[PDB]
Design an enzyme around this catalytic site. Structure first.
Site, PDB file in Angstrom:
ATOM      1  N   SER A 165      36.200  31.076  35.242  1.00 28.83           N
ATOM      2  CA  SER A 165      36.639  30.529  33.964  1.00 28.83           C
ATOM      3  C   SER A 165      36.189  31.459  32.847  1.00 28.83           C
ATOM      4  O   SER A 165      35.002  31.786  32.748  1.00 28.83           O
ATOM      5  CB  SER A 165      36.078  29.121  33.750  1.00 28.83           C
ATOM      6  OG  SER A 165      36.287  28.305  34.896  1.00 28.83           O
ATOM      7  N   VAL A 166      37.136  31.893  32.020  1.00 31.29           N
ATOM      8  CA  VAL A 166      36.876  32.852  30.954  1.00 31.29           C
ATOM      9  C   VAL A 166      37.031  32.145  29.616  1.00 31.29           C
ATOM     10  O   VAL A 166      38.064  31.515  29.361  1.00 31.29           O
ATOM     11  CB  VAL A 166      37.821  34.064  31.043  1.00 31.29           C
ATOM     12  CG1 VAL A 166      37.506  35.069  29.922  1.00 31.29           C
ATOM     13  CG2 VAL A 166      37.719  34.714  32.404  1.00 31.29           C
ATOM     14  N   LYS A 202      32.806  35.181  30.994  1.00 34.17           N
ATOM     15  CA  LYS A 202      33.363  34.844  32.294  1.00 34.17           C
ATOM     16  C   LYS A 202      32.278  34.279  33.205  1.00 34.17           C
ATOM     17  O   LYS A 202      31.199  34.861  33.342  1.00 34.17           O
ATOM     18  CB  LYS A 202      34.029  36.065  32.931  1.00 34.17           C
ATOM     19  CG  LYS A 202      34.518  35.846  34.352  1.00 34.17           C
ATOM     20  CD  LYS A 202      35.448  36.989  34.774  1.00 34.17           C
ATOM     21  CE  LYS A 202      35.218  37.402  36.200  1.00 34.17           C
ATOM     22  NZ  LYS A 202      36.388  38.185  36.768  1.00 34.17           N
ATOM     23  N   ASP A 243      43.683  45.392  42.378  1.00 35.06           N
ATOM     24  CA  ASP A 243      44.502  44.295  41.897  1.00 35.06           C
ATOM     25  C   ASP A 243      45.247  44.706  40.633  1.00 35.06           C
ATOM     26  O   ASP A 243      45.316  43.944  39.661  1.00 35.06           O
ATOM     27  CB  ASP A 243      43.665  43.034  41.666  1.00 35.06           C
ATOM     28  CG  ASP A 243      44.507  41.745  41.735  1.00 35.06           C
ATOM     29  OD1 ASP A 243      43.986  40.673  41.365  1.00 35.06           O
ATOM     30  OD2 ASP A 243      45.695  41.820  42.150  1.00 35.06           O
TER      31      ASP A 243
HETATM   32  C1  LIG Z   1      39.550  37.836  34.546  1.00 31.29           C
HETATM   33  C2  LIG Z   1      38.503  38.792  34.051  1.00 31.29           C
HETATM   34  O1  LIG Z   1      37.734  39.344  34.860  1.00 31.29           O
HETATM   35  C3  LIG Z   1      38.387  39.051  32.603  1.00 31.29           C
HETATM   36  C4  LIG Z   1      39.193  38.419  31.759  1.00 31.29           C
HETATM   37  C5  LIG Z   1      39.315  38.662  30.325  1.00 31.29           C
HETATM   38  C6  LIG Z   1      38.556  39.650  29.699  1.00 31.29           C
HETATM   39  C7  LIG Z   1      38.663  39.887  28.340  1.00 31.29           C
HETATM   40  C8  LIG Z   1      39.531  39.123  27.572  1.00 31.29           C
HETATM   41  O2  LIG Z   1      39.637  39.359  26.226  1.00 31.29           O
HETATM   42  C9  LIG Z   1      40.291  38.129  28.174  1.00 31.29           C
HETATM   43  C10 LIG Z   1      40.184  37.910  29.536  1.00 31.29           C
END
Ligand SMILES: CC(=O)/C=C/c1ccc(O)cc1
Lengths: 272, 9
Positions: free
Chosen positions: A18-19, A34, A134
């Site tokens: 979850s971010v 995260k 990925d």
């Molecule tokens: C899924 C992951 O490892 C990072 C996601 C994520 C990083 C920065 C941002 O601004 C928005 C999302």
């Protein structure tokens, strides 16, 4: 930890955790926070200090030195049941999946600028000894103001090696036919295949394959008008035999790749 | 035509 960052809204959740959006109180730097549950972590490692951490932390630290087209790890914390990662957050930002959904097939000039920047970022990972595994539009963020692309989510990655890989937890529709058929692939050539899928995605509006049979069929049908030079690069990246695919240098030297826009130019012509 | 995200795994 809980008093160094002001937590905000949930940005997303899924196989990665979850971010959340957040702000570092020290200087109002926009961040992304995260959370990964310990019980859900498959591959563990250790870095210099010998402390045992998720591999994602190991890989992020290896690629997070200096400037690049990779979202950088700023800090991390261990909790009783989870690890928390502090990441850069561009603002304003949109991921490449939503961008393509809204705009449709991209003009080739814009796909060239984007794809070029993805190539430089993956080259950077491989220089740092990291294989992302990925690469896809979902894992690419667009800094709308600066016109810069940023690679995210190393949760399926590995250290780069020259021997075969027999494990894979990335996105199947971007995985290469040698993985579908035999559960074996080599790092660079599998990356190039996923880059072919990404380039088709950009210039046609969606990925070319949804099913195992299409992936191993190796027939590329173009659903949009695409130049012959671009079609040729795509089909080269999507060669069924891995040794027939281009190197990263051959991609960047391909005639379709010449005269790339600068990031600033890309934002002004195409994003502002 | 339906365009969709694809989860890892
Ligand atoms: C899924 C992951 O490892 C990072 C996601 C994520 C990083 C920065 C941002 O601004 C928005 C999302």
């Amino acid at each position: 930890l809980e008093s160094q960052y002001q937590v905000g809204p949930l940005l997303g959740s899924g196989g990665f955790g979850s971010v959340y959006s957040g702000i570092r109180v020290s200087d109002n730097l926009p961040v992304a926070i995260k959370h990964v549950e310990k019980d859900r972590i498959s591959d563990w490692g250790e870095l210099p200090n010998g402390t045992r951490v998720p591999m994602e932390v190991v890989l992020l630290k290896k690629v997070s030195s200096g400037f690049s087209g990779v979202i950088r790890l700023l800090d991390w914390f261990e909790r009783p049941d989870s690890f928390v990662l502090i990441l850069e957050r561009p603002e304003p930002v949109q991921d490449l999946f939503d961008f393509i959904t809204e705009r449709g097939a991209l003009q080739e000039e814009l796909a060239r600028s984007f794809f070029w920047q993805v190539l430089e970022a993956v080259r950077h990972c491989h220089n740092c000894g990291v294989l992302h595994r990925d690469i896809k539009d979902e894992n690419i963020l667009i800094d709308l103001n600066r016109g810069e692309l940023k690679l995210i989510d190393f949760g399926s990655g590995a250290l780069l090696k020259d021997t075969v890989y027999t494990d894979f937890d990335g996105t199947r529709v971007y995985s290469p036919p040698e993985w579908i058929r035999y559960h074996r692939y080599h790092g660079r050539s599998a990356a190039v295949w996923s880059l072919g899928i990404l380039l088709y995605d950009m210039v046609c509006g969606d990925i070319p394959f949804e099913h195992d049979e299409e992936i191993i069929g190796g027939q590329v049908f173009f659903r949009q008008r695409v130049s012959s030079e671009c079609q040729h690069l795509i089909r080269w990246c999507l060669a069924l035999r891995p040794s027939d695919r281009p190197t990263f240098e051959e991609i960047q030297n391909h005639p379709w790749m010449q005269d790339v826009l600068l990031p600033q130019e890309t934002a002004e012509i195409h994003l502002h | 035509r339906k365009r969709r995200r694809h989860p890892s795994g």
